[PDB]
Amino acid sequence: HMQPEHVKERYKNFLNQHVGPDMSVQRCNSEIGPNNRKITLSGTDNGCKPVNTFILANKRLIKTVCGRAGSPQGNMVRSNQPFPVVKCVLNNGERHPYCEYRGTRSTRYIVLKCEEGWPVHYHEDEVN
Ligand SMILES: [Cl-]
């Protein structure tokens, strides 16, 4: 429960954007939208993210990728085993409440950036 002060907000936002143990392929719009997580494109006024991946696992398991269950990839880490994910890809909309997505489930190695052992960034594919 205790977190480094400079990590707290980045970690909170990592959980919000990317930790979705209960997420499903057909709930991208509801989960991303203002009735739930209100996930927004960084640096924008309520802008729809082009892509947002939810890892279908709990935060405890995902955090282990920052340590024993990951391997180094530059200054990031790559999971040693793959995870189930739902990738939400933008279909329509500029800003909330109009962000509409298609969700696709896959199993994939996840690449994260960690700080002090805490996940702070999920590395999305360049093209989605
Ligand atoms: Cl790996």
Side-chain angles (χ1 to χ4, degrees), residues 1-7 9-128:
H1 196 72
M2 171 150 221
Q3 294 161 20
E5 289 295 315
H6 74 286
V7 176
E9 187 162 34
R10 288 178 75 194
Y11 177 63
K12 179 190 191 186
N13 277 279
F14 175 86
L15 297 180
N16 194 52
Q17 288 164 71
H18 304 296
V19 177
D22 303 316
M23 191 45 185
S24 59
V25 88
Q26 80 297 330
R27 284 198 288 105
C28 290
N29 298 0
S30 164
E31 200 69 5
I32 286 168
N35 293 324
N36 287 291
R37 302 186 187 212
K38 205 192 170 192
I39 289 159
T40 60
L41 188 54
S42 178
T44 70
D45 285 86
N46 285 2
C48 305
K49 288 181 76 179
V51 64
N52 188 87
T53 297
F54 293 98
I55 306 158
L56 310 189
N58 65 38
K59 65 184 180 186
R60 183 174 299 166
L61 186 61
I62 295 163
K63 184 179 177 185
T64 69
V65 175
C66 296
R68 65 191 176 282
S71 64
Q73 188 184 297
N75 67 357
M76 290 191 285
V77 294
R78 182 181 169 274
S79 63
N80 292 339
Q81 289 184 75
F83 279 74
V85 303
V86 165
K87 187 195 289 188
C88 299
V89 177
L90 193 68
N91 214 57
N92 201 353
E94 282 198 300
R95 296 182 180 83
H96 294 290
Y98 297 107
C99 312
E100 295 183 355
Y101 290 88
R102 279 186 194 180
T104 307
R105 197 188 177 115
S106 65
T107 296
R108 65 176 283 133
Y109 294 101
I110 61 172
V111 175
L112 313 175
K113 194 170 205 303
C114 305
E115 286 301 323
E116 292 298 315
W118 304 85
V120 293
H121 168 80
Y122 177 86
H123 194 56
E124 304 278 3
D125 298 333
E126 196 166 22
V127 173
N128 298 276

